[PDB]
Write a protein that binds this ligand. Sequence first.
Ligand SMILES: [Cl-]
Ligand SMILES: [Cl-]
Ligand SMILES: [Cl-]
Ligand SMILES: [Cl-]
Ligand SMILES: [Cl-]
Ligand SMILES: [Cl-]
Lengths: 390, 391
Amino acid sequence: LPAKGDLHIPVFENVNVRFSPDTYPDNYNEADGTGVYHLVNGRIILKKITLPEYKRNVSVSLKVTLASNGDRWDKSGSCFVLPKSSAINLLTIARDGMKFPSVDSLKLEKMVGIVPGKDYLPTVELMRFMTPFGIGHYSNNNDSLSSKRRPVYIPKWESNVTWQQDITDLYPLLEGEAYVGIYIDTWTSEGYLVNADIDVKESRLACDVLPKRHVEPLMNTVYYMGQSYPDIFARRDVSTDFTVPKGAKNIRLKYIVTGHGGHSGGDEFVQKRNIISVDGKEVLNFIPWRDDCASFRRFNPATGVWLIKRLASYIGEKGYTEKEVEEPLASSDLSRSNWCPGSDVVPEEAVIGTLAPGKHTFTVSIPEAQAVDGNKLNHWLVSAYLVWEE
Amino acid sequence: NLPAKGDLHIPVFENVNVRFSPDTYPDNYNEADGTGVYHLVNGRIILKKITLPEYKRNVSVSLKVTLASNGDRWDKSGSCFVLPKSSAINLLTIARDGMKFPSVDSLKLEKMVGIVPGKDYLPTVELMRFMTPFGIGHYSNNNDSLSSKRRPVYIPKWESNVTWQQDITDLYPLLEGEAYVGIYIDTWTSEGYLVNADIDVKESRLACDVLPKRHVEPLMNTVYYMGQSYPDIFARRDVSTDFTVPKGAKNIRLKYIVTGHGGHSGGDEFVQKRNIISVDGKEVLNFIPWRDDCASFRRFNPATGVWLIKRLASYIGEKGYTEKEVEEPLASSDLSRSNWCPGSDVVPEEAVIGTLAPGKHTFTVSIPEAQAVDGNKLNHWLVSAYLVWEE
Ligand SMILES: [Cl-]
Ligand SMILES: [Cl-]
Ligand SMILES: [Cl-]
Ligand SMILES: [Cl-]
Ligand SMILES: [Cl-]
Ligand SMILES: [Cl-]
């Protein structure tokens, strides 16, 4: 098998992801001079990549560097790829007037685009991320503003955040021509600055043949374009049917979930079990949760802060002593439903192996999820797909 | 068509107590137990004989260490290591067979025995340098009413243990056939620590992916394992060693493992000191070993000391954005240090050398502003290095 060499793709360089109708007036706006499409008024950036026709096996990684350009919030992000066999996609919708297929309101309410339908497979996420609170733009380490915000145990603010993930399994969606993009739920004109690279390592072996891989998009509740907050789980489970062909080998489920609702007692800050199933049998069951958000403090200069009273032990003049202090607690410190401001989300994974050829059902259940209530925006960002060899 | 030897799981240490207990281990050498584990230096060093097959297919090798405190409250230095191949003198033969580190030219190495190669001796090679957190496990109980006095409002719970993992594929040559792998912790308590160590080997599933012939060249190790003193030598002179490179050596890479020490106010543990490392007089590495993120390890450090530091902090009060003088706790585990944090391992710095003329070459390590040992101010630098290459 012939080599086509490694490949470094700088998908995005210092691109401003933002909300600006004055700059990007429509949902579709022609690619700029750098080949970057700005959709949904700047909230989505998209780019056509071209990979060689690899005959050898490869590995693929995604690297994303991000900073705030003035936006002060920890907003949801998603680096994604538009699936192959789907005439309807984010681009064709915005550009060519395509629409997410109509849904049965009894089973999916008004939740368009979240599961497959006629001429539609859900967008597939290469990486889910959560921006920190104002990194870079508000990361001033000069004594002036720092002493007031920066805790004594944090020597300096980082100027940006970088995430890296192996996306080798999604290779079938990158092969040939593919549209890769980044969405950030930003509503400020300032927005964010992002870089994104896709690197491909080609095997140095003349015998290591590229396996025939497949990706099956099952679900994606991320509200990219004309979609609403996904609280449907507060009222019903969400299911989709899918087809497994003969010969499918080593089937694996990938499940990317984060919970949301930034108000007190909202699903962002409260434990809710996710039960995922195939053909009615549980294959994943867990509480999406992180107890380690303090570890991201340095990435979160613009976070809100409270004072919490605590009787704290300490070393004083006369030895081991005790005193009530008012200790700062950052919003960025709080435990959350599978993320911290400044983290990415590594997909949970279940090994299925083989399934009977034909139709199967995929179900996601978050039975105790809270509904949207006024300005309380509880919801669950869930995306999932199957990968397998043919 | 190269044969499949399979994946290998070697549980080197299970729940082994690294400790200082003359009562239990009265000598420097103590006969191995039924689990084949030798306890040396009165329990501060555990050693085990492992054997890797002579793999023909290419592989990847990983080391996983899990650790907890069994009572020791300190953030002590540790080193998981392998006794090099072509070296009659090693930690085991020194302790057991009454061998000794070769004598050294005092004008060049003072009393620093065992840190560079000598007659019948290559330095011990580190699979992983690590630094224990403050009392993890033994002091990690979370539903103790006297725990909220130690645990900050932003740390929901103490971790009960710490787990480090690293890819040690490049050290495969030191592991093939029979080898002694061990763990050293600078502990002076009977309680000590509890550790697990797993070495796992993943074999390629391709009949055509051949294992490359590889070599490890041990250059230095200043870690004070056995009858060795604190390495503050850098405060007075640079340390060099010569080494031989054979014809045909391809893709030479230097690995460099450094941590700075001296845990008093102003000591080399808490102060930035540039490291200049050279091959044949030319610099190949030059940087300040340093970590600014030690606060990120807070949840692993339940027995850390704590100070109150006054700070005018902004915050959301019961009437909007406000401002007030607080006494914010600062843990020792939060402080920036010379390439480590209590609870962290150290990933070796690497330098691509490429090729070197066959014959003698010189490796030199300089930390020019390192401070000397001064009474109970125990400044020193734990440095180890080795080259790797395919032949
Ligand atoms: Cl803002
Ligand atoms: Cl409805
Ligand atoms: Cl300043
Ligand atoms: Cl102790
Ligand atoms: Cl001397
Ligand atoms: Cl201390």
